[PDB]
From a paper:
β-Phosphoglucomutase (βPGM) uses allomorphy in the catalysis of isomerisation of β-glucose 1-phosphate to glucose 6-phosphate via β-glucose 1,6-bisphosphate. Substrate-free βPGM exists as two distinct conformers with different activities due to cis-trans isomerisation of the K145-P146 peptide bond on the multi-second timescale.
Using both solution and crystallography techniques, the structural properties of substrate-free βPGMD10N,[name] were investigated. 1H15N-TROSY spectra of substrate-free βPGMD10N,[name] acquired in standard NMR buffer indicate that it adopts an open conformation and is present in solution as a single trans-A βPGMD10N,[name] population, equivalent to substrate-free trans-A βPGMP146A (BMRB 2792034). In both monomers, Mgcat is coordinated similarly to substrate-free cis-P βPGMWT (PDB 1ZOL21 and PDB 2WHE26) and the position of N10 is analogous to that observed for D10 in substrate-free trans-A βPGMP146A (PDB 6YDK13). As expected, both monomers exhibit a trans K145-A146 peptide bond with the alkylammonium sidechain of K145 located in a solvent exposed position between the cap and core domains. Such observations imply that the trans K145-A146 peptide bond allows access to a broad conformational ensemble for the allomorphic control loop.
Author numbering:
A (entry chain B), B (entry chain A): 1 to 219
The structure:
């Protein structure tokens, strides 16, 4: 039986994308650029803050100094950080609390493997910290977004190999990173997005302990 | 108040997209071409049967005669048609049957505005024919994505202007078609996909007569 579950945060435990979006939208309006809507925002997902800022600026062909560019990027983060003060337990995705409980009951290790620089904060705000055996620190891994490194780190940090673990991810880069680590991916979303070769569920309510076991047995 | 509701079929009333995919995949295997998966399938949505085959031929730089091209296109459609023989009333999406009943009870016209060449057949199999005042024939109109023609035809066939109507769609091109027709769109899906400028519900169980009336009043 698998010995640990390695969780990404956004798209699995809760929604942080919503707040990245509002933070960029707030910035954009604030310097009076139009066009930063939910469709536009797709061009910002999985993309660096600087490339994200550049794309926004290009909407208005706006010009900036190096100093203004620095200040805008910092201001986006300040916004994001204000907007996540809102996070609570009511923001936890369905099935997730109950999965963490049943994992903890069965002495399966639980680690976070997220790029979020606000991981620990977000977990405390959602009242989830007590379930987590480790949180991989993205600053100590410093790897690129499809790299296995964060998953390896999260596994190692709870004293297991990635081959003893399942990873949960809503993104194709994430799924690829779990695969590269050696762990077994189970996706959440649409097969059109993630691929036909892994177990995908439609929403997080399907991530149950019993489901996770059956998947493990059947690989 | 709006006087007609113009329905897309696939993604609104039921799923036919899955059958299209299975038949293309079955054909691709038969001719020994790999890479016909759900993700590649996204590139066949809203594409003619012939253009779809070509995109599949192009995965392996495969060539065929004009005669065999026609044969492959035919076999795929036949298999599709065999596969939809199983469509039933149980395959109607949540909320739709009740919405149809309520529209009819309130003497609001109901038309099909679908590209499906099997629309009448599909509504007979789902036992929906009774609710529909008209079905726009896609053989008699334009096959451009996001062309308003099918929506215009549907409205006209129930004796309304498009400006008197609501259109239900789950794809961006379909939303654009509704807009262009003059009708008011209500999307089903994600704003990331459909746009932020229209009302979108997350699934079809939100498509209620009360909801449609509220959208109409606020437009
Ligand atoms: Mg994610
Ligand atoms: Mg559709």
């Amino acid at each position: 039986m698998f010995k640990a579950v390695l969780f990404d945060l956004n798209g699995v435990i809760t929604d942080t994308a919503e707040y990245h979006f509002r933070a960029w939208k707030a910035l954009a309006e604030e310097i009076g650029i139009n066009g930063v809507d939910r469709q536009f925002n797709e061009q910002l997902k999985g993309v660096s803050r600087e490339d994200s800022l550049q794309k926004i600026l290009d909407l208005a062909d706006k010009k900036v100094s190096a100093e203004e560019f620095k200040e805008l990027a910092k201001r986006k983060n300040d916004n994001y950080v204000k907007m996540i003060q809102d996070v609570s337990p009511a923001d936890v995705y369905p099935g997730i609390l109950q999965l963490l409980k049943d994992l903890r009951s069965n002495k399966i290790k639980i680690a976070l493997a997220s790029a979020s620089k606000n991981g620990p904060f977000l977990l405390e705000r959602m009242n989830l910290t007590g379930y987590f055996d480790a949180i991989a620190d993205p600053a100590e891994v410093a790897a690129s977004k499809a790299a296995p490194d964060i998953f390896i780190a999260a596994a190692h940090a709870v004293g297991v190999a990635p081959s003893e673990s399942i990873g949960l991810e809503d993104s194709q880069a994430g799924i690829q990173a779990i695969k590269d680590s050696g762990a077994l991916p189970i996706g959440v979303g649409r097969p059109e997005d993630l691929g036909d070769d892994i177990v995908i569920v439609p929403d997080t309510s399907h991530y149950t302990l019993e489901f996770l076991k059956e998947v493990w047995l059947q690989k």
